[PDB]
Amino acid sequence: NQYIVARPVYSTNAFEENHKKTGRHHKTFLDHLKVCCSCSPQKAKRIVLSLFPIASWLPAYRLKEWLLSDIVSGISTGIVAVLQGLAFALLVDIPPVYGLYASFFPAIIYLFFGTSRHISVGPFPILSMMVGLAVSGAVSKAVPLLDDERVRVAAAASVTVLSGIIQLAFGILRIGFVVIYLSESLISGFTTAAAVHVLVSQLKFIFQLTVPSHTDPVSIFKVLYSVFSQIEKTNIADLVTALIVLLVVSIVKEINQRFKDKLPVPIPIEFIMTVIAAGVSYGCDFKNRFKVAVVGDMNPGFQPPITPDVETFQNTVGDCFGIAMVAFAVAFSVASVYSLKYDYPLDGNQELIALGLGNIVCGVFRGFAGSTALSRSAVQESTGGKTQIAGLIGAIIVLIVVLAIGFLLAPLQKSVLAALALGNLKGMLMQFAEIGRLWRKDKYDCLIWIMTFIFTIVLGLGLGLAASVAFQLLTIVFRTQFPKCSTLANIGRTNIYKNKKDYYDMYEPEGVKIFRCPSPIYFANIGFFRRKLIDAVGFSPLRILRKRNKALRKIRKLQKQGLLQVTPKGFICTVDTIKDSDEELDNNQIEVLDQPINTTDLPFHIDWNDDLPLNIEVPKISLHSLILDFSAVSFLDVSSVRGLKSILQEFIRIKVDVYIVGTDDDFIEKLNRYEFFDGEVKSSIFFLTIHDAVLHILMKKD
Amino acid sequence: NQYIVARPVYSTNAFEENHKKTGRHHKTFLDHLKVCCSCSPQKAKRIVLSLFPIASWLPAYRLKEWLLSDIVSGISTGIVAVLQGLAFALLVDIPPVYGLYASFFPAIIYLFFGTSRHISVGPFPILSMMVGLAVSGAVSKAVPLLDDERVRVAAAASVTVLSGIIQLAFGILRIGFVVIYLSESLISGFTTAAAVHVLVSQLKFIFQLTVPSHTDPVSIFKVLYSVFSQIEKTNIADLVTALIVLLVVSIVKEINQRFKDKLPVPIPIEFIMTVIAAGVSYGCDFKNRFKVAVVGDMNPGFQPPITPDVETFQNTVGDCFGIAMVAFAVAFSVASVYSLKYDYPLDGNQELIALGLGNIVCGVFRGFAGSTALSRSAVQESTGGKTQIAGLIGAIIVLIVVLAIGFLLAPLQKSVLAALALGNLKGMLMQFAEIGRLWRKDKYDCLIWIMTFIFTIVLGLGLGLAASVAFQLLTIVFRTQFPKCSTLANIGRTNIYKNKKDYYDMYEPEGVKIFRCPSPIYFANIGFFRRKLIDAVGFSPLRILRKRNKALRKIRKLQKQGLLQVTPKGFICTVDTIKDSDEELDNNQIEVLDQPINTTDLPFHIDWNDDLPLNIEVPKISLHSLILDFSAVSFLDVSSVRGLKSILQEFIRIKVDVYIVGTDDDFIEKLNRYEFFDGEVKSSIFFLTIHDAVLHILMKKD
Ligand SMILES: NC(=O)n1c(O)c(C(=O)c2cccs2)c2cc(Cl)ccc21
Ligand SMILES: NC(=O)n1c(O)c(C(=O)c2cccs2)c2cc(Cl)ccc21
Ligand SMILES: [Cl-]
Ligand SMILES: [Cl-]
């Protein structure tokens, strides 16, 4: 293995001169506007087919290989949807039939507009809690039992419609890339804090206590206080039933995971528990005997369309944005796992449109907002679901319950529903281990997990999320705030330059400094960069320039007085031991000491690093060349270029050659727009590599 | 010029093996605690001298060269401080003597604790507006015309004390670097919007109209409606006087800038206008004759110390955080200008401590918050100010007015003070030109400017700033969100690799792809990076792996059937035209096709890119080596590392050798903590440069 190279030393300009470029186009935004104005029938076709995905997947359905799978998966998911709809309607604090509406409408809409083939569309616990909190606030801000339920049901429907409107708007504006602004640490911390929120929310049903409609901030603490202050009023029958169901479901749930091979089909413990709980409750007349809360009678059939309330929209708009983003983020994440697994394209923009339309329709018909539940989606997929036909079948199961078999669920205890929801919390609850994992791998990510968790707990799920996204953006600045700048040296007398402090027997060419900032330089960075560069070269170039300008002034003074006489050969100290009086420039004249030194007046050059006439003294510097390794400087901003231009001008005015190496062509293209180059800062300072600049410097000094 | 290199090809591990590394001394956090816990006698001296800068600069005072200069600067600044205090107390909507308190107390405290030598400490218009808005809100949120003034004075004093407490806390915690989080575009947009706010705030005094205490959001609009709704009630005498003063001052101000060379000393148009205005008002009895609003009778003396109100603290903590941050940012910017001009160190933490103590004392003695006015600081410096003795003499002038000669300012109209404040707006209002300039230079900074302006106009100064800082952090993600990734090729047949689309006669070694991402890869980035890499290589490695696994499965099945035999020379097709039978794997078995292929059962090796038996087909790829140019990848985060590892694992599983080049040693050190390396992803994939990896690949293929 030999790395052997023989080429010219290349400055970036010299390289462009010797190597012809290719034609480039600006791709004017007007051109983008031009392309948008296509109207080609094929484009129209693709667009409509993009907006109505069912017209493409339905016709290509493999009936023989997919129908039975979707039918079986649909029945399974349909049952889960019914029970989860009831439970999550409890979480919204409205009658449980509206959870059935929330499990029905969004899914039917998704069948026509969704691009995912595996998610089960409907409510999930975090969004139901967020909707319930939005409702409590809306009601509290409304200028003046069943009546209270009516108001909550109306506020929930309005919140749902506004969330769907926001989602649909974001999908029409093609901003489905917003999910990228959420890191995995943020999602982990947020979902752990949200699992704690859900746990606390189920306590009023486990104990059967009456808890006020608390709002954020610190609603979780407010609820905990409400639950524990009145803990003696707890219904024992509710608690025991909840404990038994929770204990049994968890034991059986683990068995399914451990013994997947041994089992022909997983035991459906959650379904078995509800049927048994409902049967026993009905059989032993638990509602009368132990005064247990039960699901109760639900009137069959759907509600008539409700008009969204504009007053509610004004009151809850901030909440709705949080609800819309959370709904989209969760759905997209769940969908992504499946699309990747099954190798099909998932369109983020279409998902926003589909989820948004589903929500608007659901809200109008009195259901609450939901996108997808990870547990329900897993069931649809694990039971063999192939397409969104499984989702349609599931919706039909929900419809049957809503229209004909709703009465069967009447004797089911609320605590049992709450206990099932608690069982699903374990996956999310196990995310506490991530803090330790993150701590070893990356402190910034660990900080993000912790801040997100704290923000989600103290402020609510919605406000906490906004604060968490802001803090996670701030950590990007934390990462690049104090870059580990370095001085580089040559290793092995070849073209390799590394940290001057890392290896033995390194070599700096005499009078050359090579400085590296391993980060992009911008507003939060450039002062630190200047401090580190001045520490690396060992002096401040502006201080040196000011001391030289002062000396030049004294020299000119003595020259005019006569004590000093100019000469082709240096200077004449006509008068020895001369006077010692400083000019003491005023506040309005001191700026002259910062101007480029011009000594043309004097015929000869003043070597500023050699002795000066008449004891005049100025710090001497050995630096004649400064190389800035800009390979890791990704971008620059106006502050960095202003600061940069400033630093470079100062080095150049003190006769030190400056070289910027390791940048690409886009970089110099960008730097040309900033009006960076002029006289006394030229594009000649850019070289290809550190070794190009070093060899150029050595030839100059030769 | 000739770049001539002859060295070995170096993998990062090989280079380290061949070049001994120096002592890697880790820095223990406990050790930091140890160094922080030194308590040496000299260290104590340095700390106390740091907290009491006066004990350091006073003894070194050059009486002969500074005394007179500081005296003249002090008298000049003291006069400006009196008038600016009265005007800015108008902006706080309290009696104007509290502006005199605000000009007195913080300057006296800063004399002892400040590190700057040129700023004039006291109120400025933006902070007075912010304090006035905080008071209005506090008053409203309080639970149940002198009394109104009394309530407003108490709330202003409490807001001042809490702002000072926050500043002092930030200074003790050594967080004076927070100033870096404000870009120049943000500051420009914010100060232009704040100048518009100040302009609108002066209209009730120019016209002499009664305006309610409007709060934010959109307070600027609320006030404008109130002003022009009553425009008919305008006092003309006030207006005319204001216009004349504003006109004369503006014209003469211009002359001072234009005729500095011809002028021995700047004309004091603001003082002359104030003296003439007050004289005519008294002489012609303007208060009675034209019913004009005058400054009125101020009672001489200071107020007794007042106790901060905790209720006001609770109601204003957020406004007080905003006030503290704005005060420190303004003071530090002005002080940094002057400390760079005169080359002396400026301690930001000490600055935070001094301003906090000054604000605490001012608020206790019924003044309001203030850090420094650029207009007054410039006067102190321009008039010859050398040390903070000029600030002491200015505070003595303010004291003389408060105690003895305040009655002289009784007949001065408020419209004149408002007109004087308007004169100072010109510098900030001309910043509107920045939009066009920044548009040409950098559209992200133009966006920061415009959004800061809009946030500060719509929301207020405090909330606008918070929203603007958040948006400016979001623009950093906007910059690095969709990196312009590229494929590189060789130019010149030497170690230079550039964008494959930029030059003619470039060369890619056959089967090698070189991909560059010119940005750090983090969470908002890695999905885009994967998409671009898959577009660059021309296939998805996971799709190729899944198809090969399917082929292998069919093969093994046919081999089981016997229809296929195995030879070191290939596969025997005893039976041809096989019955195609896709296994149609179900949802729970499909993940097997994503696993590393282990065809060790077979004696030979299946050239996956040659033709397979019985028409078994798999997409063929020409890629055998992928080089990732990571020179501009500053940092990685957990999401990016996970995404990176997944990508690499997939490429390795389809037998594509992967190389990462151009990183430094800190990078690999960091990557070792993420548990990135294991079997099948080794540190052998890191090479020094692109040419090292290319030459290694070529030797492997030889
Ligand atoms: N398989 C699986 O994971 N399941 C769940 O997670 C369920 C639930 O979470 C809830 C029901 C009510 C509130 S939560 C669930 C229900 C049924 Cl009927 C069948 C499977 C189920
Ligand atoms: N030189 C300069 O810039 N000056 C200003 O900007 C002044 C003011 O802004 C105000 C006075 C009252 C309300 S504002 C000012 C005042 C005086 Cl007496 C002398 C110079 C001044
Ligand atoms: Cl779930
Ligand atoms: Cl000012």
Beta bridge partners of A687: A11, A661
Chain B stretch 677-696, residues whose beta carbon is closer than 8 A to a beta carbon of chain A: 688, 691-692, 695-696
CA distance A428 to chain B (A): 19
Which burial class, exposed, middle or buried, applies to A493 when counting CB atoms under 10 A from its CB (0-12, 13-18, 19+)?
A: exposed
Distance CA B525, CA A568 (A): 63
Q: What sign results for the dihedral spanned by CA atoms B6, B11, B13, B14?
A: negative
Counted residue by residue, chain B has a size of 702
At A91, list the tokens: 């979480």
Q: Which helix (H) or strand (E) holds B469?
A: helix B461-480
- Return the closest-CA partner of residue B157 out of B308, B263, B260: B308
d(CA A694, CA A9): 9
Choosing among A387, A637, A650, A702, which should be mutated to test the B contact, i.e. which has the most B CBs within 10 A?
A: A637
| Burial of A610 from C-beta contacts in 10 A (0-12 / 13-18 / 19+) | exposed
Asked whether the beta carbons of residue A4 and residue B5 sit closer than 8 angstroms, the reply is yes
- Sequence-distant (6+) residues with CB within 8 A of A365 are A101, A105, A302, A303, A305, A306
The 3 state secondary structure assigned to A535-592 is: HHHCCCHHHHHHHHHHHHHHHHHHHHHCCCEECCCCEECCCCCCCCCCCCCCCCCHHH
Place of tokens 């899914």: A107
Q: How far apart, in whole angstroms, are the C-alpha atoms of residue B584 and residue B286?
A: 98
Contact in structure between B333 and B111 (CB atoms under 8 Å) = no
Task: Closest CB to A634: pick one of B183, B520, B675.
Answer: B520
Query: How big is chain A, counted in residues?
Result: 702
User: How many other C-beta atoms lie within 10 A of the C-beta of residue B243?
Assistant: 13
SS3 content of chain A, % helix, strand, coil (to 5): 60, 5, 30
Cα–Cα distance for residue pair B361/B303, rounded to 1 Å: 12
Distance between CA B507 and CA B146 in Å, rounded? 85
* Rg of chain A taking only CA atoms, in angstroms: 36
CA distance A275 to A282: 10
Hey, which residues 333-392 in chain B have their CB within 8 Å of chain A?
A: 341-343, 381-382, 384-386
The answer to whether B359 touches B173, Cβ cutoff 8 Å, is: no
Give which of B296, B487, B348, B363 is closest to B109, Cα–Cα.
B363
DSSP 8-class letter at B297: P
**Omega of the bond leading into A8 within 30 degrees of 0 (cis):** no
Q: What CA–CA distance (Å, rounded) separates B330 from B465?
A: 13
Rounded to an integer, what distance in angstroms lies between the CA atom of residue B354 and that of residue B106? 8
Q: Which domains does chain A have, with CATH numbers?
A: 56-296+323-475 (no CATH), 486-539+621-701 (3.30.750.24), 541-615 (no CATH)
Alpha-carbon distance of B469 to B178, in angstroms, equals: 11
Q: Is residue B639 less than 8 Å (CB to CB) from chain A?
A: yes
**CA-wise closest residue to A654 among A594, A580, A584, A573:** A594
Could you give the C-alpha distances from B203 to A328, A374, B270, B273, B607, in angstroms and in order?
47, 59, 19, 19, 84
Give yes or no for a contact between B46 and B367, defined as CB atoms under 8 angstroms apart.
no
At CB < 8 A and 24+ separation, what contacts does B61-69 make? B61/B387, B61/B389, B62/B386, B65/A584, B65/B386, B66/B386, B66/B387, B66/B389, B67/B389, B69/B384, B69/B385, B69/B386, B69/B390
CA distances from B258 to A359, A541, B244, B483 (A): 66, 32, 21, 48
Distance between CA atoms of residues B573 and A109, nearest Å: 52
Residue B699: how many CA atoms within 13 Å on its side-chain side?
12
Residue that the structure tokens 């005058």 belong to: B294
Q: Give the DSSP H/E element, type plus range, for residue B129.
A: helix B125-141
**Helix and strand counts by DSSP (H, E) for chain B:** 28, 9
Q: Distance (Å, rounded) from C-alpha B603 to C-alpha B567?
A: 8
User: B485, B515, B493, B508: which is closest to A19 by C-alpha?
Assistant: B493
**What are phi and psi for residue B11, nearest 5 degrees?**
-90, 155
Structure obtained using: cryo-EM
CB B103 within 8 A of CB B366: no
Scan residues 534-593 of A and list those with Cβ closer than 8 Å to B.
Answer: 542-543, 546, 584, 586-588, 590-591
Run of H or E residues at B690: helix B690-701
- Phi and psi torsions of B664, nearest 5°: -95, 180
Residues of B in contact with A502 (CB under 8 A): 21-22, 665
Please tell me which of the candidates A382, A480, A481 has its beta carbon nearest to residue B587: A382
Using CA atoms, how far residue A33 sits from A27, A304, A401, B330, B440, in Å, is 10, 44, 51, 43, 21
Alpha-carbon distance of A462 to B678, in angstroms, equals: 40
Q: String of b and e for A344-379 (b: at least 16 CB within 10 Å)? A: eebbbbbbbbbbbbbbbbbbbbbbbbbbbbbbbbbb
Give Cα B300 distance to the centre of its chain.
44
The CA–CA distances, whole Å, from A6 to A407, B6, B492 equal 88, 9, 11
Q: What is the rounded CA–CA span in Å between residue A92 and residue A86? A: 10
Which has the closest alpha carbon to A375: A412, A421, A411?
Answer: A421
Q: What gap in Å lies between CA A631 and CA A633, rounded to an integer?
A: 6
Report the C-alpha dihedral over residues A137, A142, A148, A150, rounded to 10 degrees. -100
For residue A54, what are the contacts with CB-CB under 8 A and spacing of at least 6?
A111, A112, A113, A388
User: Please, which residues have CB less than 5 A from ligand 3, an ion?
Assistant: A 373-375
Half-sphere exposure of A653 (CA within 13 A, CB side): 22
